[PDB]
Amino acid sequence: KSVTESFAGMIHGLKVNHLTDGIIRRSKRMILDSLGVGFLGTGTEVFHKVTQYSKIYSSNTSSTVWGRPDFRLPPTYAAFVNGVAVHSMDFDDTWHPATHPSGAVLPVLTALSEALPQTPKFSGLDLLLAFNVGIEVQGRLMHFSKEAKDIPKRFHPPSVVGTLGSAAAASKFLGLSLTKCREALAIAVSHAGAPIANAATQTKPLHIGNAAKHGMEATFLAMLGLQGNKQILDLGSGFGAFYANYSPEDLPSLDSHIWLLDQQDVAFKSFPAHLATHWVADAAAAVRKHLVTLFPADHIERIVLRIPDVQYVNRPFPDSEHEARHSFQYVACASLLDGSITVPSFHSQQVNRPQVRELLKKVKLEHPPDNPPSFDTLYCEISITLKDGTTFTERSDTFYGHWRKPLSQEDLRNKFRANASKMLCRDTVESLITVVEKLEDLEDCSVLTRLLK
Amino acid sequence: SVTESFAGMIHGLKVNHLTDGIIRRSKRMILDSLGVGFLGTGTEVFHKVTQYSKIYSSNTSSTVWGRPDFRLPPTYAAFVNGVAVHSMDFDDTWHPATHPSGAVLPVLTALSEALPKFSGLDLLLAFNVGIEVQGRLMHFSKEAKDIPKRFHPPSVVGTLGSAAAASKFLGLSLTKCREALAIAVSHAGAPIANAATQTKPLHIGNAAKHGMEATFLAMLGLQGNKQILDLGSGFGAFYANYSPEDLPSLDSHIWLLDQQDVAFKSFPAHLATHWVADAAAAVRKHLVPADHIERIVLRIPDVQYVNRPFPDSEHEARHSFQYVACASLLDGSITVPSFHSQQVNRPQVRELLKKVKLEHPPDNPPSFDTLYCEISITLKDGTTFTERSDTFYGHWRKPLSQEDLRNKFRANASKMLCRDTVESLITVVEKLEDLEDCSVLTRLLKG
């Protein structure tokens, strides 16, 4: 047969009986983190704009807009705005090969659980199964091109593999047949193109939104019988259009299948910025220990960041939240000036402080050959020379939260608490934590969705 | 920057910049698009996209061309109407390769209805702005001159052209036009493989839809990359060897449509097969005998997604060099019903399809501007006949006359509309220049 048919086979064939306790732990962590960052993102300008746009549409079915119990959107637009919320602050999870896999799946399954209830109630295990199918389809697909393991320079993966992950999760959750799962994937491929250039702008979050949206839309068109190319995932003129040196492979038998999450964990972010800057901040946080026992900003000779050549996060003078989130230089100098980087660190009011500008003017980037542009092998080394000639240097190979040194469950819960506390009552936050941690045992998925408002 | 140059051109151009040529050609393009859309509203693809779209409703709405019994939001109205226009791949063709009219006209129509007076000149201005933007974008990559092999141009340049036309028609500021383009870029990716199947029409639909959506998001103030058209990591992500250039100053600007006409199709198939049919129609003149032929050799470029020696369905038949050749030989002509399943899988067609050999000489590159088709038929007794078509009637080198294009419109639109309504549409489009309000044209689409 074909690789495309293999993907349809994996989506259709996988059952709750194939889920492992490891992927269930990782899935519950991913879901809790995604909900927290979404709730936080509901306060952004981007989420406001996408909800003001979406509100003009209405349907016979509708779904919750996270944190805002006063209005509902069609399931498509609800998933759209919720994915925007999770990716509104570049604060959701990161995986390897490079993508942001949770934001494109969870809002879709939530909207479907509300919008299209099955005659048998949806269970937490059904949500986990569809979630892991989407997470598996993306990533399993990314291993068909080596460049997917590097930080992207052409297309933004969450719009490419995230869209097909959405389609796979929706097809699984609703219960589509083998060939309709295939057709949902083939249709989603024609909704999957978006460039990396918009990463530093107000548009970037919509890459998750549409990824959540379009996949669902493809599934709907697949249910109506709309057909696509039977070999869309193993043609260079099909899905392979998004990757250089595309090299697809058949999927393994379910008897020999191993979930990707059981072998490759996700990284969780501590502050809302590009993952590469999490190395920068860490290195900066170390070197500041030799300078501060307030930072002596008035008399610093220079700041040197040894960091790989990722141009779209090379921003010596960012103006907005979004540019600061994609700025090596701002993250380094802000960590040096304040002593830590958190959410308010990326407010444009804070980014444009005169101390930030004067210290920022001193930041030099250096790209040594030994460190490649990849979240798995990237490092950051920071050197600060004083006007008196003294030079200090510290290096970060792995930061707390990276898949090599993951956040503890307590720290991930506390991130969730701090984020959700702007939208949810305390008791709602604690109950939602409980429900997600015990999601595998949840007889009725409604319990989770009813807490998102 | 080039991006700012596009925003400048879109905002700056006025009705007074419209030329006699681009108006004549725009009226031809619009009439053809309406006819082919009405024809396409009877297809399964239109059914699928309207059964999907009907679930959405908004404060404003717009006409569904073949189904006046309900209304859609202008977004979904443009979606399904563009689908109808591209439902059987019988839209027009332009150079560099794209299908620029199908992605633009439904958007301007839905906007004139949903979000009100717009004049025929305002419609023509926004339409030509979209067409111009598509042309200028395609001139930034060499492969745009060729028949596509990775992305489907109407989903890439058509999306930004739609966004430009919508932004122009609604009246967005300079920077909001720029932002509409930057947002549209993030909605613009679709591969050529789905060209050979039932999904293909949606590439126009989404191109009409997403462009409009981008404009709406721009109107709300959503920002994108201000130099999206100057980055290979931006719009250039869709092209090999992307090399953008500034647009000429309005002091020296020339419309592209005024220099490069569009080709109009005679039968619903990929434009390349229009060479094949023409050549085939010639060679049978020396024969008119399906059972007396040794072989059929069809010289034609290496375009794999129209290389289907044994098609299964409607969509493969529309993308089959071999089927077009064999149907032309058997019937003497190709018409719309020629692509029905019972006509594709008939035994005479199969007996000839088994005989078709393709040859790809260097003289044939995969490009609509330099393509030719040469067909040779050898009989079992050794007799060989050869005929060649370098340009077919309807190609921009031999464009369809007004009589033939009007008759195409009549034949197609009459499937859905009362023929007197068809004549009224002929007059209104022919006289669009003097039309006080677009309402007159859109009312005729109620029928």
Author numbering:
A (entry chain B): 4 to 296, 301 to 460
B (entry chain A): 5 to 120, 124 to 295, 303 to 461
Sentences from the paper on this structure:
The IRG1 protein, also known as CAD, is over-expressed during immune responses and catalyzes the production of itaconate, which functions as an immunometabolite possessing antibacterial, antiviral, and immunoregulatory activities. In mammalian systems, itaconate production is catalyzed by immune responsive gene 1 (IRG1), which is known as an LPS-inducible protein highly expressed during the inflammation phase of pathogen infection. Itaconate, the decarboxylated product of cis-aconitate (an intermediate metabolite in the TCA cycle), is a small immunometabolite that can control innate immunity and possesses antibacterial and antiviral activity. Our findings indicate that IRG1 exist as a dimer in solution.
The detected asymmetric unit contained two molecules (A and B), which comprise the functional unit of IRG1. Following the refinement and model building process, the model of molecule A was constructed from residues 5 to 463 and the model of molecule B was constructed from residues 4 to 460. The mouse IRG1 structure revealed that it is composed of two distinct domains, a helical domain and lid domain. The helical domain is formed by 270 N-terminal and 80 C-terminal residues, while the lid domain is formed by 140 residues in the middle of mouse IRG1. Interestingly, an unknown electron density was observed in the active site of our IRG1 structure. All the side chains of the amino acid residues forming the active site were orientated towards the unidentified density. Based on this observation, we hypothesized that unknown density (might be from substrate: this also suggested by Chen et al) fixed the close conformation of IRG1 by holding the A1 loop. Structural analysis in this area showed that K152 and D153 from A1 loop formed hydrogen bonds with S381 from A2 loop.
